[PDB]
Design a protein around this nucleic acid. Sequence first.
DNA 1: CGGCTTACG
DNA 2: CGTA
DNA 3: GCCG
Length: 327
Amino acid sequence: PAYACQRPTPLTHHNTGLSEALEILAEAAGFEGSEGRLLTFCRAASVLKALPSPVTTLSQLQGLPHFGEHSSRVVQELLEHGVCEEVERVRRSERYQTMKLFTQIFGVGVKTADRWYREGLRTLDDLREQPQKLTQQQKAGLQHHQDLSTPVLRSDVDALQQVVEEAVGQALPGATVTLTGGFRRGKLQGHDVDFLITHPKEGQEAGLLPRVMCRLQDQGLILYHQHDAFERSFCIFRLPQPGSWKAVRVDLVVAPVSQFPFALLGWTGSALFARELRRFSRKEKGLWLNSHGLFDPEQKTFFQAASEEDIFRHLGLEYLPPEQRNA
DNA sequence: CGGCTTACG
DNA sequence: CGTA
DNA sequence: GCCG
Ligand SMILES: Nc1nc2c(ncn2[C@H]2C[C@H](O)[C@@H](COP(=O)(O)NP(=O)(O)OP(=O)(O)O)O2)c(=O)[nH]1
Ligand SMILES: [K+]
Ligand SMILES: [Mg+2]
Ligand SMILES: [Mg+2]
């Protein structure tokens, strides 16, 4: 099928090298502002992840969605020579390496990285010498960059969840913490830990996240956070280690229980899976999907879901467990 | 050709 | 602009 | 860059 939400995509697969190469080109397209080419290369990479066996000859790409002349030539050169000249040229270019380094900083997007690049900046130390150019968020990202470049491990995640649950249970007894993001899809490591928080009584979650953050702050666990009312927090946590501690990015989201299936579906991802599912919803079904609900514009009504299963059924899609949403 | 991702901080 |  |  043409959309990633119509097929299972496991975490590990049989075309790792080919998909990695196409994702380099996708990433390079994004650094140059070409969102359309980024999407096509990401989609072609995702198709290969969904295949049941390795691609060994060009003919296997026949009829595969999102493979045209450019992506097929990339695959062809990898099959024939083990390397793609275009991909290798991107890898070693100063532009790619610096945009990759800069955009990996928490608080730095493509627009900011591109301005710094054009101004001649190239390294983290270059940015550190110009702290007048940095927001407080970027200063935090730069200071903690080395720890944040270390993958979070599944072992780390359970220790963090207990701490978050402790603060959440004091902020509002009966509130729950659900692991979402990449670790919910089965990843053994990640760039951060994502949590979704709710309470079984509609309305009780109002105003919860400031109370949660206050309690985490008082426990001494918050190295950075954005802080009147808010429902999403992007922070840097102090995580325990043997004889020391390390900084870890943690995302917290609060949703009312009525919206929990939609929020769980959205924040579980993958990011490409979510965009493809929303695109499918809008273009094939005429329904508008987000992390709050599923809207029929013609009837001006919202579909009530009690589960992610509900949502897949309402879109006419076979259910995909989180481990099969690794588009 | 137009379309390509979303709401919140 | 950033979360990304 | 590719789809419809
Ligand atoms: N609508 C929407 N959702 C998004 C977007 N980006 C991410 N999400 C949703 C879907 C994502 O699954 C979720 C969390 O995003 P991360 O924590 O940045 N990534 P993950 O946990 O997959 O991996 P790792 O942390 O190891 O890099 O947020 C976006 O641009 N749009
Ligand atoms: K960034
Ligand atoms: Mg994550
Ligand atoms: Mg996250």
